[PDB]
Scaffold this active site. Structure first.
Site, PDB file in Angstrom:
ATOM      1  N   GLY A  96      -3.389  -6.372  -6.856  1.00 18.27           N
ATOM      2  CA  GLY A  96      -2.057  -6.492  -7.709  1.00 18.27           C
ATOM      3  C   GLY A  96      -1.302  -5.128  -8.143  1.00 18.27           C
ATOM      4  O   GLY A  96      -1.537  -4.111  -7.617  1.00 18.27           O
ATOM      5  N   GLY A 149      -2.387  -2.121  -3.489  1.00 18.00           N
ATOM      6  CA  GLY A 149      -2.982  -3.376  -3.856  1.00 18.00           C
ATOM      7  C   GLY A 149      -1.908  -4.330  -3.066  1.00 18.00           C
ATOM      8  O   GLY A 149      -0.985  -4.096  -2.758  1.00 18.00           O
ATOM      9  N   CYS A 150      -2.432  -5.565  -3.358  1.00 18.01           N
ATOM     10  CA  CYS A 150      -2.089  -6.733  -2.635  1.00 18.01           C
ATOM     11  C   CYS A 150      -0.611  -7.170  -3.474  1.00 18.01           C
ATOM     12  O   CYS A 150      -1.075  -7.280  -4.861  1.00 18.01           O
ATOM     13  CB  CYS A 150      -2.828  -7.943  -2.669  1.00 18.01           C
ATOM     14  SG  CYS A 150      -4.182  -7.991  -1.566  1.00 18.01           S
ATOM     15  N   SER A 151       0.489  -7.397  -3.016  1.00 16.19           N
ATOM     16  CA  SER A 151       1.608  -7.854  -3.264  1.00 16.19           C
ATOM     17  C   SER A 151       1.978  -7.125  -4.821  1.00 16.19           C
ATOM     18  O   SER A 151       2.355  -7.844  -5.747  1.00 16.19           O
ATOM     19  CB  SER A 151       1.605  -9.378  -3.671  1.00 16.19           C
ATOM     20  OG  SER A 151       1.569 -10.082  -2.343  1.00 16.19           O
ATOM     21  N   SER A 152       1.718  -5.870  -4.801  1.00 17.27           N
ATOM     22  CA  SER A 152       1.879  -5.252  -5.979  1.00 17.27           C
ATOM     23  C   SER A 152       3.594  -5.124  -6.474  1.00 17.27           C
ATOM     24  O   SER A 152       3.717  -4.708  -7.581  1.00 17.27           O
ATOM     25  CB  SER A 152       1.336  -3.571  -5.917  1.00 17.27           C
ATOM     26  OG  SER A 152       1.966  -3.121  -4.752  1.00 17.27           O
TER      27      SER A 152
END
Lengths: 11, 490
Positions: free
Chosen positions: B362, B387-390
Site C-alpha cells: 500500500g 506497492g499495491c494501490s499506493s
C-alpha cells in the site's frame, strides 16, 4: 470560473 | 481577431484565465505545459484546457459522441477491468497452490489486451483528431506561418469563400497529430475531425458553410500535404518537455499516461495549481540548462524501507544487496529492512531524506497517520510508494483530499510515485528498478555508468520494463514536478 474550478480543487 | 472555438468568448472567463496565466502559469518552466481534464456538467463533453508560459491559453470542449461509447460506458469498462486485475493479484498464491499459474498468467495477459483496447478506443473516439492537444512538440512560428498560409489556401479553395481567422493554437492541433512524413501515416479520420471543427468555428463566428456543400475529402488530402511540408522541414533542422495533468475528481482512475499518444512521454499529475506553485517556489537548485527547472534532490542521505511486513521476500531478494552496495554503503542511506518503520522513523525520513523508497504494502499509511504528514514543517522527501494501490483511490475510483497523495503534496513533497490499482511484486519491482536506474539512484545495468533523467522521464521509460504494460505499468503514476538526482549534492 466554472470550467476553471478543476484548477482549484482541494485546500 | 483570431477565433479558437465554436462558441462565445465570455469576458469574465477570459479575464480569470489571464489572471491564472499571470499568477500561476507564468512561473512554470516554458518547456512544461499544464493540461486540465474535466467533464461538462452534462457529462457529454471532455473539457481540456492547455496552459503554458508565453503561450495563449487554449480551451477545448470535446463532445465525446460527435461522430454508446460515452463517458459512463468507458468509465464502467475501466472499473470492471481494474476489479478483475486486482482479483488476479490477490489470487496469485492461491492459483499457484492449485497448480494453475498458467491459467492465472493467461487471465492477466487477456486483461492487458482489454485495457490496451479501451485506451485505444478512448484515444480514437474521445480524442480523435484532437489528440494533438497533448503534443509535446516544440512550437516553431516560422514553420507554423508557412502551414497557416497553405491551410488558409485550402479553406479559400474549398469553402465558399467562393474572413474568420484561426488562432495559432487551432493550427497547432494539426501539427500535433504527429510526423506526417512517417511511412504509412494516415491522418484522414483525424483531419476530418479537425476540419469539422474549423468549419464550426467559422460558422459560429459569422462565416457559414453547409457540411454537404463541402468536399472534406479534398480538404484532407491538401492539409495532409501541407503537414508533410511542415514536418519535412521540421525534421531536417532539429527539449526536456514535461506535461503536468490536472484531473477532475473522477478522472484520476484513468491511466492517461498510457494512452497511445502519451506512451513514453514525460507526464506527471498535480492536484491543483496551488500545489504546483508551492512546489515550484520550494525548488532546490543543483549543487552545480533545462534541467535547472526541476527540483534537485541529493543522492546522499535517502531512506529505504524494504519489505516492512516481512512477507515480500522476492522484493527483498531483488533489492537488498543492490541497496546495500549502492545506497547504504557509499551514500549514507538509512536502511529499514523486514521490520515495520515506526511513525517517528517515517516522519524523520520525510523531513530529512531527499529520497524515500517504500517497498511494502500500500501507501505506508498503516505506519504513519495522515495528520502527522500535515503537521510537518516540510516534507523534504521525494517519495516512491512501490506497492499495491499506493495512490489509494476509493472503491469508486475517486481521488480524495484526505488520501496520502494529497497529503504529501500539501506537505510539500516534490513528487510522489504511486499506483492506481494492485500490482504483483515481481512486475512492479521491474518497473521500480527501471525508475531507479533511469533516475540515477542506481547505476545502469543493476537490475539485469549513471543516467540522469527527471523522475517523470524515468517513470515513463521504466514502464517498458514490465511484463505487462497495461496490467502493471499503467497503474504507475507520478504526482508532482520533475525531480533530478544531484549525485554530488548535499
Amino acid at each position: 470560473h466554472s470550467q476553471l474550478e478543476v484548477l482549484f480543487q482541494g485546500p | 481577431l483570431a477565433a479558437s472555438a465554436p462558441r462565445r468568448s465570455s469576458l469574465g472567463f477570459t479575464l480569470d484565465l489571464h489572471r491564472i496565466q499571470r499568477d500561476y502559469i507564468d512561473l512554470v518552466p516554458k518547456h512544461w505545459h499544464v493540461i486540465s481534464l474535466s467533464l461538462s456538467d452534462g457529462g457529454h463533453d471532455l473539457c481540456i484546457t492547455r496552459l503554458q508560459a508565453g503561450q495563449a491559453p487554449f480551451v477545448l470542449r470535446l463532445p465525446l459522441e460527435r461522430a454508446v461509447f460515452d463517458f459512463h460506458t468507458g468509465r464502467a469498462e475501466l472499473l470492471e477491468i481494474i476489479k478483475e486485475i486486482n482479483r488476479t493479484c490477490h489470487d496469485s498464491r492461491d492459483m499457484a497452490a492449485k497448480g494453475e499459474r498458467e491459467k492465472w498468467w493467461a487471465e492477466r495477459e487477456a486483461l492487458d489486451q482489454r485495457l490496451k483496447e479501451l485506451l485505444m478506443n478512448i484515444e480514437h473516439v474521445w480524442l480523435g483528431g484532437f489528440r494533438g492537444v497533448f503534443s509535446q512538440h516544440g512550437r516553431r512560428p516560422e514553420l507554423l506561418e508557412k502551414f497557416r498560409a497553405m491551410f488558409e489556401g485550402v479553406l479559400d479553395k474549398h469553402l465558399p469563400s467562393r474572413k474568420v481567422v484561426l488562432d495559432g493554437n487551432v493550427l497547432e492541433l494539426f501539427i500535433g497529430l504527429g510526423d506526417a512524413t512517417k511511412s504509412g501515416a494516415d491522418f484522414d479520420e483525424e483531419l476530418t475531425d479537425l476540419l469539422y471543427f474549423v468549419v464550426d468555428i467559422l460558422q459560429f463566428h459569422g462565416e457559414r458553410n453547409a457540411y454537404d456543400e463541402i468536399d472534406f475529402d479534398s480538404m484532407v488530402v491538401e492539409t495532409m500535404d501541407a503537414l508533410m511540408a511542415y514536418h519535412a522541414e521540421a525534421n531536417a533542422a532539429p527539449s526536456h518537455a514535461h506535461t503536468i495533468l490536472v484531473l477532475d475528481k473522477q478522472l484520476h482512475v484513468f491511466p492517461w499516461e498510457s494512452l497511445p499518444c502519451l506512451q513514453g512521454l514525460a507526464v506527471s499529475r498535480i492536484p491543483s495549481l496551488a500545489c504546483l506553485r508551492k512546489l515550484l517556489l520550494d525548488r532546490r537548485r543543483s549543487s552545480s540548462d533545462p534541467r535547472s527547472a526541476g527540483h534537485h534532490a541529493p543522492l546522499s542521505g535517502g531512506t529505504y524501507i524494504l519489505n516492512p511486513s516481512s512477507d515480500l521476500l522476492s522484493t527483498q531478494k531483488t533489492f537488498e544487496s543492490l541497496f546495500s552496495t549502492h545506497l547504504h554503503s557509499p551514500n549514507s542511506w538509512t536502511r529499514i529492512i523486514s521490520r515495520p518503520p515506526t511513525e517517528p522513523e517515517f516522519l524523520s525520513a520525510l523531513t530529512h531524506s531527499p529520497i524515500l523508497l517504500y517497498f511494502g504494502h500500500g501507501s505506508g499509511a498503516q505506519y504513519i497517520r495522515s495528520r502527522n504528514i500535515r503537521h510537518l514543517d516540510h516534507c523534504r522527501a521525494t517519495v516512491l510508494l512501490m506497492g499495491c494501490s499506493s495512490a489509494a483511490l476509493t472503491a469508486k475510483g475517486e481521488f480524495e483530499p484526505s488520501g496520502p497523495v494529497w497529503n504529501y503534496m500539501l506537505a510539500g513533497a516534490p513528487a510522489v510515485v504511486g499506483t492506481l490499482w494492485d500490482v504483483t511484486d515481481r512486475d512492479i519491482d521491474r518497473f521500480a528498478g527501471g525508475v531507479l536506474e533511469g533516475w540515477g539512484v542506481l547505476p545502469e545495468g543493476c537490475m539485469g555508468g549513471r543516467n540522469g533523467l527527471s523522475l517523470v522521464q524515468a517513470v515513463a521509460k521504466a514502464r517498458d520494463r514490465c511484463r505487462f504494460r497495461y496490467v502493471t505499468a499503467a497503474a504507475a503514476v507520478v504526482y508532482g514536478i520533475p525531480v533530478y538526482v544531484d549525485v554530488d549534492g548535499k
